[PDB]
Subunit: 200 residues, 2 copies
């Protein structure tokens, strides 16, 4: 089986679960870990689905944010329970929500467009790659749609949460092709993983 | 003046240029550096042109990769010499280029598409966010289009440089409206900065 593991924050958590399912690696690097019957590609979280989409990985792990931003159609067996963070709408304290068309800066433009549609809002979406809290300070946007964990970044920049869009957790996702061709092998790894997750 | 400064690789070269032009900051945060007559927005490299195009910044700096990957109408007043890195086409050493459709992984899909057209190649372009050197060994792509400085990461992953697409440098870019509204202040700051930058890059 080939797995796409999100490098960064959750690497070690997921790697320990794999180990608890009983996996052994023969060689490891910053981007690849192989052993008997298991290969882990250590990729950026947003690339997890692209490694599955393209059929190079059978199973992957990645957050709710990745999946909602990039419409996948991946098999979603279950997820890891820990509430790691939240996708929120935020804006300058007391400014409330601007009348008319809202200028919103975000690293998640699809998520924001669907959010704006759901509220019935006219929005002008300004995609950024990082440090999204600077947009309101600089006059680039009125609001932001971004991830918050402790709320420090928002609080420290005089931004307040105006709406909670969704909680972010690490989902287990399966390539639909591998689910059909390697059915029994996938279900077997997945059962062991779900046991470790429950127990943990 | 409001400057949009690229975090990461080019951050110290640019901040050192401003330091030598006479800029002194009284207050500094991760995202905002304030000084007499100057505010610096510290942003991701690909966001520099966004801050300028929207008109919230007057002058910005970004590498050739940003500039060629995302076309803008911004003005480049002058040339900043230093070669930082290179954009290359790379693949498994010894393999070459497949004769049919080429699967290329990259963080720069427009640059890669432009490269393919310049070759008359039919390409299947796979966008990635980083660790692009893993694509060929995972079977995700035949080739990659990525940045290298010394070739180390490529070399240690058994990827060879098949072609040099362009040399990457720092560029200065100006919001065209700011050139209207703050004409003499901009022109004057750009004069001091080119003097400093020239001396630094050459000597």
């Amino acid at each position: 089986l080939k797995l796409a593991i999100p490098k960064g924050r959750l690497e070690e958590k997921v790697m320990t679960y794999l180990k608890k399912t009983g996996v052994i690696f023969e060689r490891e690097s910053s981007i690849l870990r192989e052993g008997k019957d298991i290969v882990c590609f250590m990729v950026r979280p947003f690339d997890v689905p692209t490694y599955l989409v393209h059929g190079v990985a059978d199973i992957g792990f990645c957050g709710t944010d990745v999946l909602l931003e990039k419409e996948t159609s991946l098999i979603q067996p279950f997820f890891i329970p820990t509430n790691i963070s939240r996708m929120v709408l935020a804006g300058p304290k007391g400014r409330g929500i601007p009348e008319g068309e809202k200028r919103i800066a975000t690293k998640f433009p699809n998520v924001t467009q669907r959010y704006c549609e759901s509220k019935g809002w006219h929005c002008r979406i300004i995609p950024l790659k990082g440090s999204v809290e600077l947009a309101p300070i600089a006059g680039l946007s009125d609001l932001i749609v971004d991830i918050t964990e402790t709320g420090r970044t928002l609080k420290e920049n005089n931004l307040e949460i105006l709406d909670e869009i969704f909680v972010i957790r690490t989902h287990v996702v399966v390539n639909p092709v591998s689910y059909r061709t390697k059915r029994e092998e996938v279900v077997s790894f997945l059962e062991k993983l779900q046991e470790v997750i429950e127990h943990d």
